[PDB]
Design a protein around this ligand. Sequence first.
Ligand SMILES: [Zn+2]
Ligand SMILES: [Zn+2]
Ligand SMILES: [Zn+2]
Ligand SMILES: [Zn+2]
Ligand SMILES: [Zn+2]
Ligand SMILES: [Zn+2]
Ligand SMILES: [Zn+2]
Ligand SMILES: [Zn+2]
Ligand SMILES: [Zn+2]
Ligand SMILES: [Zn+2]
Ligand SMILES: [Zn+2]
Ligand SMILES: [Zn+2]
Ligand SMILES: [Zn+2]
Length: 581
Amino acid sequence: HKSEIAHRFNDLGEKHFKGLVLVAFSQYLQQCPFEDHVKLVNEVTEFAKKCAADESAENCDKSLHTLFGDKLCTVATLRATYGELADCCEKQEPERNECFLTHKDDHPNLPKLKPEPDAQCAAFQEDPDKFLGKYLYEVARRHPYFYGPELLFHAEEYKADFTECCPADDKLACLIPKLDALKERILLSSAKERLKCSSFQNFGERAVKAWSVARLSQKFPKADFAEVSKIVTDLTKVHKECCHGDLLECADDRADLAKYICEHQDSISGKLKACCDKPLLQKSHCIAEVKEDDLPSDLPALAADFAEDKEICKHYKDAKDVFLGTFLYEYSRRHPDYSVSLLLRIAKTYEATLEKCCAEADPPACYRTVFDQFTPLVEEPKSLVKKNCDLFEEVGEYDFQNALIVRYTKKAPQVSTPTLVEIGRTLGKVGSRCCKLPESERLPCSENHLALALNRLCVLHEKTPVSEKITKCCTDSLAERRPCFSALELDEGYVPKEFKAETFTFHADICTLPEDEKQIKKQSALAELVKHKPKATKEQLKTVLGNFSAFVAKCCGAEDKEACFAEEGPKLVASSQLALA
Ligand SMILES: [Zn+2]
Ligand SMILES: [Zn+2]
Ligand SMILES: [Zn+2]
Ligand SMILES: [Zn+2]
Ligand SMILES: [Zn+2]
Ligand SMILES: [Zn+2]
Ligand SMILES: [Zn+2]
Ligand SMILES: [Zn+2]
Ligand SMILES: [Zn+2]
Ligand SMILES: [Zn+2]
Ligand SMILES: [Zn+2]
Ligand SMILES: [Zn+2]
Ligand SMILES: [Zn+2]
C-alpha cells in the first residue's frame, strides 16, 4: 500500500479509526485532558482522509509509528507532564516507539469512575459522540494495555445502556446495575489482555503461542491441528500488535481472523453460529468469548502415538516443535476440565521426560510410563480448588478474602498493604464466580482466574520490587507461576514490622463509608496485623479481626461516635497485640 494510514482508514471506517486512535493516544498519554486528545485524533484523521484522496501526497508514505509518534511529540507541556516520553521524542523510529512502550504506567492512581445518572444522561443527550468518546478516553487511560476493538465493543454496550435507561422513569435503577455489570466485564477483559501482554514481555512469543494452542484446542476440539495452528499464528500477531499500541493493524487483522473463522466454522466449532451472524465488532468479541464445543466422538487414543511408538526419540529430535505442538493440541482438546497452565505444565513434563529417556540406553521402557507422570500434576490443583471452595461455602466472601489476605501477606509481608488487600479481595471474588459453577468447570475457572490475579501482583511488583521470592515466581516460568506462589511460605528471617498504634486505631470517618470501603479499611488492618505478628496463627487473626469488627459496629451505632472510638479504641489496640503472640 502506498499509504498505510489511508489503507487503515479505508478498511476500518472513520468511526472506528477515530475511536482506536483516541484509545491509542489516551493509553500513551494518560494524564492529558480529553480535549487535547480529541484534537490530536481530529488532526491525524484529517490527514488520513487527505491521504485516501491522494496516496502519493507528501508524508502519506510514512509509517504509522512515524505519524503517531510525531503527533504524540507535538503535545503542549510534554516535558513537564511526561518527562520520560520527552526523552523518547529525541529518537527516530523504531527506537522511539520502543521507548514509548518501555514507559507505560499500569497503576496511575486516577480517581475512581462513579456513574452520575442525571449529569451523564444530560451529557449523552446533548452530545453522544463527545460522551461516548469520553468513556473510551477514561477507560483507556485507566487501563493502558486494554485492546482497542474490545474497548470499542464495550463502548457500544455503554451506549446501549444509556439509550435504554435515560428516557425511563427511574433512571438510576435501570442504569446502575447495568453499569456495575459492564465494570465487572471491563475488569476481567482488561486482566485477560494484560496477562497476554505480560506473557509477551516476560517470556516471549513462544510461550504466548503455547498458551493459545492449549486454550483454542479446548474451545475448538473439532478443529484439526492445521486449523488451530493457523488461528494461533494469526491470533498471536493480533495480540502482539494490540499490546504494542498498533491498534489500527490489530483491529484490521482481528477482523480478517474473525472472517476466516466464520468462513470455516463448520470445521472449527458448532458454537460459532451464534457469533458469525453479527456485525464485525460484535463478531470478534463473540468468538473471543465463545463457550467450549462438545467433545468429538472420534478423538484418538494418545498412548500409541505419544507413549508406545518406538520411534519417539527420533520423532522428538527430527521434528521437535511439531511433535510437541501436536501433543499439546491433542491433550488439551480432550481436557476442557483442565486449566491452561496445568496443560502447559503437562506439556513441559512430557518434553522433559523425552530428553531424559532419549539419552538413556533403553528409551521405550523409560517413556512408556510418561502419562503416569501427569497424575500428580492434576491432583495438586484439584485439591487446592476443592479446599478453597469448601472454605468459601462455609465462611462467605468476606472471611474467605480475609483468609487469603493472611495467606498472601505471610508469603510476601514486604508488599504494600493496598496491594495485599487488592489481591486478597480479587482472589476472594474467584470463589464467588467459580465455586458456584458446575463441578467440572471449577478447576479451570479457579486456576485461570487465579493466574489473572497473580499476574496483576507481578505487574505491580515490576514497578515496586520488594521481594526476591515474588520476583522468581513472576519471572521464572509462566506455567509454574501459581504453584510457585502456592509453595511460598513465611521467611524464617523476615524481621517483623514495628508496631504503630495509629495504624490499628479506627475513627468515626469509617461509619459513613460504603460497605466495601469499610471492609477494605478493616482488611487493611488485618494485613498490618500479620506484618507486625507474622507468626500468629490464622485463627488468632480471625478472632482479633472479629473484635475490631464488633468494636466498629458498636461505635458506629453509638449516640456519640467520636467518644466511643476515643474510649474503646486504645484498649482493643493494646489487647490485640497480646492475643497475636
Ligand atoms: Zn498496507
Ligand atoms: Zn471496526
Ligand atoms: Zn497538553
Ligand atoms: Zn477501570
Ligand atoms: Zn468483553
Ligand atoms: Zn511487548
Ligand atoms: Zn508497532
Ligand atoms: Zn484475543
Ligand atoms: Zn512413529
Ligand atoms: Zn469441585
Ligand atoms: Zn473464566
Ligand atoms: Zn478512619
Ligand atoms: Zn461490614
